[PDB]
Amino acid sequence: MNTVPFTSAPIEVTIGIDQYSFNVKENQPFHGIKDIPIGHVHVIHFQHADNSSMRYGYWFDCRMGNFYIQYDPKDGLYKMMEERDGAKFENIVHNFKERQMMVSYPKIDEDDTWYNLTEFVQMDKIRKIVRKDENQFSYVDSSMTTVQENELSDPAHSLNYTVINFKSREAIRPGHEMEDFLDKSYYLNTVMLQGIFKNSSNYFGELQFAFLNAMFFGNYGSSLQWHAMIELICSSATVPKHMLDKLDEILYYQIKTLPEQYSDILLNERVWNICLYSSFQKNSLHNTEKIMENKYPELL
Amino acid sequence: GAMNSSNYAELFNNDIKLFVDDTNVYRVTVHKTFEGNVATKAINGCIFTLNPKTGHLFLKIIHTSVWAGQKRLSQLAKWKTAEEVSALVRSLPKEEQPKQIIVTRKAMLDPLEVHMLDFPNIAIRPTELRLPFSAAMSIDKLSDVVMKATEPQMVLFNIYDDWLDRISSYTAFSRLTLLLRALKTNEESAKMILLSDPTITIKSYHLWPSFTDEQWITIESQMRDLILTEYGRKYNV
Numbered sequence A: 001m002n003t004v005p006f007t008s009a010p011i012e013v014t015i016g017i018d019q020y021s022f023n024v025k026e027n028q029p030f031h032g033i034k035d036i037p038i039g040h041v042h043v044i045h046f047q048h049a050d051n052s053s054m055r056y057g058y059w060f061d062c063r064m065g066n067f068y069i070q071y072d073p074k075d076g077l078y079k080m081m082e083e084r085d086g087a088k089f090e091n092i093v094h095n096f097k098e099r100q101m102m103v104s105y106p107k108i109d110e111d112d113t114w115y116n117l118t119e120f121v122q123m124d125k126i127r128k129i130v131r132k133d134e135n136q137f138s139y140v141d142s143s144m145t146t147v148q149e150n151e152l153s154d155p156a157h158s159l160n161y162t163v164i165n166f167k168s169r170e171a172i173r174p175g176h177e178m179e180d181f182l183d184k185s186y187y188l189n190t191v192m193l194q195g196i197f198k199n200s201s202n203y204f205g206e207l208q209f210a211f212l213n214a215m216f217f218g219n220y221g222s223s224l225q226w227h228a229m230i231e232l233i234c235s236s237a238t239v240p241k242h243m244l245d246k247l248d249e250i251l252y253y254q255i256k257t258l259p260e261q262y263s264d265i266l267l268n269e270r271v272w273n274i275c276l277y278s279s280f281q282k283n284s285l286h287n288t289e290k291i292m293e294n295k296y297p298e299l300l
Numbered sequence B: 001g002a003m004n005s006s007n008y009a010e011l012f013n014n015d016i017k018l019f020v021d022d023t024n025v026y027r028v029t030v031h032k033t034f035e036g037n038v039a040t041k042a043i044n045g046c047i048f049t050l051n052p053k054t055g056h057l058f059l060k061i062i063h064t065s066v067w068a069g070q071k072r073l074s075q076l077a078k079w080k081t082a083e084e085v086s087a088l089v090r091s092l093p094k095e096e097q098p099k100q101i102i103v104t105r106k107a108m109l110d111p112l113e114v115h116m117l118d119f120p121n122i123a124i125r126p127t128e129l130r131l132p133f134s135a136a137m138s139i140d141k142l143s144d145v146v147m148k149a150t151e152p153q154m155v156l157f158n159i160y161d162d163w164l165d166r167i168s169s170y171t172a173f174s175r176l177t178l179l180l181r182a183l184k185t186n187e188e189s190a191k192m193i194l195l196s197d198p199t200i201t202i203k204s205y206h207l208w209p210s211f212t213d214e215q216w217i218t219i220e221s222q223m224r225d226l227i228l229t230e231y232g233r234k235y236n237v
């Protein structure tokens, strides 16, 4: 189990840690989060009490270093930093644990939610989508745009998701125009899986990361990416059977975790109705279709 | 974006553009089988690709053999149209290629856009106009060449005959759409109007009769009357 120490909490803020969240009052004696499960990526995220505008946060993996949070009063945000002095950090964390100034990562033992949402998500791939190579953790916020959004404007601050565009020469083989547009298997299996992602794990990991950025930060371009990657699979007639079964589990847990009140903005009616009721895979997503029909029958 | 009454004069500026109508691409007769089921028999069709400024009509005849062994023909017909339009553009010298293609039915947008990915600078546009190009097969010489075709074939026409010698392309297009709207609303009556007088003939190299300017005014008035009538006969007014 690992720990993320806070120098202090000078401004009132709602702090999220993965799917959990808690309020910290201005200058409350809060010194961080303990008992964070090793083995998973995590995200620690922030929404200031005074400006709900810009949710922002940091993807990290405690196996990759010792990280902490210090508020910066000039830039006006909680910043993640890395402590290279391991003896400093152990000494600083042990003091705050002894004074019980930390919240405990509150995982129920039965509960596989976070594993199920991050199964294929790796820090190394996050760091290629979110380019800031001097840090081991990755900052994301509500406003960051994607490479593809910028094509249709600061490149350093972009989400470099894999560009998917169903009406593009990458997606459509000359002479197979109608075939490739109505059945995207070529684009999924040859262009994206074999060519770009290399395997379905990396594909699922980017899909999961896009979903999480959409849910935790309201990142609109991430939501676009999540839906595009779903639609690319559902609109393919030929998909490995293990991919479909895993997709069904992935989406099931995403829909399960989505706040009931955010469904109106985080879920694209057209994509979901096409994927569940019209697409080649309309009958291959049983768990997802059942939870969607019982939790969001309005969308459908 | 979409073409409508507001931006109607754009059709007659000097940016090359084509209308594409796919209505007559996939044509069938519906009939009973011996067993008393229903079946279709395809007949020859055509893509109607028209330069509204010049009158040049690129009539790509669609021979029934292209449907042999195919499924979902109404969907294929859209993609076949887009394939043939894209092949037409590629066949034209660069300075003759259109800068816009306007499709008369929205279901042609995605097939044409995908076939024209190689031409990112050609705008593929819908229209809100209700253009009567489906009635092209009421023009006897166009119907004749479509029905006689034994193989795929492109035939070039000028749908305005020699009208542009005497009138503008706005006026020629308005005449054409009035003639075609009439032929679509009541073909027999429209054709009676156009041919009632045997002294006015159709030149071998033309589609429509050789009306004088005054006779066109009479003809045009008769077509409006026909369209208004049928609109009464239809709604009882």
Ligand SMILES: N#CCC(=O)Nc1cccc(C(F)(F)F)c1
Pocket (backbone or CB within 6 Å): A005, A006, A007, A008, A068, A069, A083, A088, A089, A092, A093
């Ligand atoms: N001095 C100094 C800078 C510095 O590195 N301070 C620091 C390092 C590691 C953890 C912590 C925390 F627990 F207080 F948050 C603070």
